[PDB]
């Protein structure tokens, strides 16, 4: 008569896109809609039991999270798990739920390895996956004439979730899976000046199509040094892999969008440097159901969670927890409707898999693997004003690059420079 | 009045050096000696609760083992953990015991990362550590004139415990920590013929001092291809990193020792190839207490475990579980004797750490980190007969290379070839 739902998420730390102070309300909203739908779990009273994926220091732990997951299983026997979003938290809990034959839902866990559902069985990813980033880079290379060599630069703060790694892992593995072209990679550390000589050296030696996964400040400083070293959009192109748009403001207000402006007198040289630079982000949902969700989400989070939800790309994570939780109740209702129980995880999950769905994020497609298709946006500088704006859009289910508001991808040469220079890289 | 000891080991699979069918009796022996020692835990009745580190398929699992470790904690509250031996099993259980403030003892878990006792607190390694292999390689390079460049080749079967990786990880990290010389590495797959062209190419380009971690058959085939390509002990030297002496028979009988002989008519060429080859293994204990232990161990395993314990280097793992368990009872008695309890894990562990001990394996030294020092043996071919015999010995506590039975390390040139060729590798 009641469905127990176990959550393993950062319950105290709010710095995470999947923090409970941001996913919690988004889940309240979804539970509220289920009670008001007579067609969704009729007469059921879906309860929730919570677990902190975070350890003592407040960060999500490859220990605290699985320890939390076990205490919830032996105390409540939940039918489904929610979270974690951290890769190193999600991996161990996923192996436990896959063993327990319990479904697992999360907007996080975007890494390449989570894709292996032979191990992470019953693990359905309703948020972005990094393998999906390979799809967009593949489409972007096919539709731009780069079929030889590209360069990747990524940094990580030590002891975090290693986000830029898994972003580049999912991009490297899926792009070489589909194009078999030369993809060079190099890891660095932002706070270490010793590396920047190495990076500028490798920039002009290891490729012209250059992708950088770094903080906004690191990517800016790199552009300044590139400009200083005479590297321009005629021979190079710099893709900041900034998926949550940290180098940008929200799409709601704060018009226009200037990432190169920093207020340090270097902004004048920075603007010109960013002429060779483009930013790859996620796609803000267009549907006005998103905007209503955000509104309800901000209200509900201030009221019940004493937290303020600012606008930004991060909010598709709580949004996808909301939608993914709706996707499950649908499938459980469907499973109950054909004589099955809420514990038929295999039946329940296969309903959710290979299935389109309409939630607050609009159209979302759970692929044959159990991973939401990810839509991307490409940002470019209008050489006139200097501000950035979306010029391309990648439908992830269709793998189609569509131009945005009839905008043209700025190129200093009138066309993209070639991924290989003239007479070799020498 | 009773001390609960939780074991997380392969209880059914016997292929592991830390299999329960081999460690179990070695533990029975150590428990038997404690009951007969009035000076060790007087009046105490040490209990044991067991847990299979292995999953369904019988291999040790990064999932089964921590799940096992939790049932033993919440059902018995043990005072100490024993095992796991598998790296990927131990790492998760280690983070659980370190959180639980419970000591963990194992002869396995040799990886570089287990060395970090800030994460794996109260984890005392009474067996070999791969970092310790770096120490022997360091001594071996310092006492042989190689201070420039060396080459490493390693292979692993997919889905195992990745043994050759962690062996090379511990060797690479500790040798560059101490010498800062160029150490080139290359992974390969034994069953893939496509790699052997790649390997022979790298042999004659990436160094002359060459270490190989592979199966005996793979290392042999490589030697034949090396000989075929005209690579001899005049310019090269090939160290098989065969720690458990899989390419050799037991030190008890089966005289003499020929790893190049295979009974396929290629043996004639194999002997000559192995003239440039040397084998790095662990050190068989000299003390006659070991030999009595083996005798009691084999009897006790046939009788109570219906398992037959063949002779060989693998047997120092159960031997070190035996000694490590004695090391703990000592310290717990010591801790009870100064008013402390069996749960004073930090006090107990610090007694065990930085401490020499006399056990069935003879002299063993738990270093400042909590890792038994590892003694290594170097084997070489007697050019007369072609058989291999120990020519060097590395005391791990003292880091001294001592000649064995007045034997000389055979060199075709009268001295070791230089780690770098004449006018470069070109």
């Amino acid at each position: 008569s009641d469905l127990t739902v176990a959550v393993v998420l950062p319950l105290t730390n709010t710095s995470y896109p999947w923090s409970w102070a941001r996913v919690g309300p988004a889940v309240e909203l979804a539970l509220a809609r289920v009670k008001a739908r007579p067609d969704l779990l009729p007469g059921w009273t879906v309860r929730m039991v919570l677990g902190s994926s975070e350890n003592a220091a407040g960060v999500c732990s490859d220990t605290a999270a699985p320890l939390a997951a076990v205490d919830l299983k032996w105390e409540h026997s939940p039918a489904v798990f929610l979270g974690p979003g951290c890769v190193y938290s999600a991996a161990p809990v996923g192996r436990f739920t896959a063993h327990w034959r319990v479904p697992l839902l999360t907007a996080g866990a975007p890494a390449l390895g989570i894709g292996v559902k032979d191990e992470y069985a019953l693990t359905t990813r309703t948020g972005p996956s990094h393998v999906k980033l390979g799809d967009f880079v593949t489409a972007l290379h096919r539709r731009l004439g780069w079929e030889h060599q590209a360069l990747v630069l990524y940094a990580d703060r030590l002891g975090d979730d290693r986000p830029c790694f898994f972003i580049v892992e999912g991009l490297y593995m899926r792009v070489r899976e589909r194009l078999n072209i030369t993809v060079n990679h190099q890891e660095f550390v932002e706070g270490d000046p010793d590396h920047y000589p190495k990076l500028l050296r490798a920039v002009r030696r290891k490729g012209r199509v250059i992708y950088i996964c770094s903080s906004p400040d690191a990517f800016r400083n790199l552009m300044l040094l590139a400009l200083n070293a005479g590297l321009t959009g005629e021979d190079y192109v710099f893709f900041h892999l900034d998926v949550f748009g940290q180098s940008l403001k929200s799409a709601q207000g704060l018009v226009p969008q200037k990432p190169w402006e920093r207020g340090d007198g270097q902004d004048r040289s920075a603007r010109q440097a960013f002429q060779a630079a483009k930013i790859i982000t996620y796609k803000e949902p267009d549907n006005p159901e998103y905007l209503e969700f955000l509104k309800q989400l901000k209200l509900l989070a201030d009221k019940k969670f004493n937290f303020t939800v600012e606008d930004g790309l991060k909010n598709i994570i709580p949004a996808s927890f909301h939608d993914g939780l709706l996707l499950y109740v649908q499938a459980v209702t469907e499973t109950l409707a054909q004589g099955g129980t809420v514990t038929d995880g295999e039946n329940i999950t296969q309903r959710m898999w290979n299935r389109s769905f309409q939630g607050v994020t609009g159209y979302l497609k759970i692929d044959r693997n159990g991973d939401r298709d990810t839509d991307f946006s490409l940002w470019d500088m209008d050489p006139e004003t200097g501000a950035f704006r979306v010029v391309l859009n990648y439908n992830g289910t269709s793998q189609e690059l569509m131009a945005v508001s009839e905008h043209k991808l700025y190129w200093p040469l009138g066309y993209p420079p070639p991924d290989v220079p003239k007479c070799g890289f020498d | 009045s009773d001390l609960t000891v939780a074991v997380v080991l392969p209880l059914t699979n016997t292929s592991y050096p830390w299999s329960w069918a081999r460690v179990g009796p070695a533990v029975e022996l150590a428990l038997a000696r404690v009951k007969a020692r009035p000076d060790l835990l007087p009046g105490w009745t040490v209990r044991m609760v067991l847990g299979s580190s292995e999953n369904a398929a019988g291999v040790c699992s990064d999932t089964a083992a921590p799940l096992a470790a939790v049932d033993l904690k919440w059902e018995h509250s043990p005072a100490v953990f024993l095992g796991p031996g598998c790296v990927y099993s131990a790492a998760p259980v280690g983070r659980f015991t370190a959180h639980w403030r419970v000591p963990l003892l194992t002869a396995g878990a040799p990886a570089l990362g287990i060395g970090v006792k800030d994460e794996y607190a109260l984890t005392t390694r009474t067996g070999p550590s791969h970092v310790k292999l770096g120490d022997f390689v360091t001594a071996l390079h310092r006492r042989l004139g190689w201070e420039h460049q060396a080459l490493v080749l390693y292979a692993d079967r997919l889905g195992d415990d990745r043994p050759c990786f962690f062996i090379v990880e511990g060797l690479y990290m500790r040798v560059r920590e101490r010498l800062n010389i160029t150490v080139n590495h290359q992974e390969f797959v034994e069953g893939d013929p496509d790699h052997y062209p790649k390997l022979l190419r790298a042999v004659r380009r990436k160094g002359r001092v060459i270490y190989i971690c592979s199966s005996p058959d793979a290392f042999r085939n490589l030697m034949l291809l090396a000989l075929n390509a005209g690579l001899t002990g005049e310019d090269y030297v090939f160290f098989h990193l065969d720690v458990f002496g899989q390419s050799l028979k037991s030190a008890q009988g089966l005289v003499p020792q020929k790893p190049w002989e295979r009974g396929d008519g290629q043996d004639r060429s194999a002997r000559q190839a192995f003239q440039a080859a040397k084998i790095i293994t662990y050190k068989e204990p000299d003390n006659p207490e070991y030999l009595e232990f083996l005798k009691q161990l084999k009897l006790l395993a046939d009788k109570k475990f219906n398992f037959t314990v063949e002779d060989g280097l693998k047997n120092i793992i159960p031997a070190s579980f035996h000694d490590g368990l004695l090391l703990y009872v000592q310290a717990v008695t010591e801790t009870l004797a100064q008013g402390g309890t069996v749960t004073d894990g930090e006090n107990i562990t610090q007694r065990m750490w930085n401490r020499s001990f006399q056990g069935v394996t003879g002299y063993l030294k738990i270093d400042r980190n909590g890792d038994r020092d590892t003694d290594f043996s170097l084997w070489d071919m007697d050019p007369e007969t072609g058989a291999f015999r120990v020519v060097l010995n590395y005391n791990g506590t003292s880091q001294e290379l001592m000649a064995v039975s007045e034997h000389k390390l055979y060199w075709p040139l009268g001295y070791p070839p230089p780690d770098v060729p004449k006018c470069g590798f070109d």
Partner: peptide
Amino acid sequence: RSSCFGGRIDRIGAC
């Protein structure tokens, strides 16, 4: 590819 040395012990964050 790359030789990941010291990068944790888990079949997820390793290469």
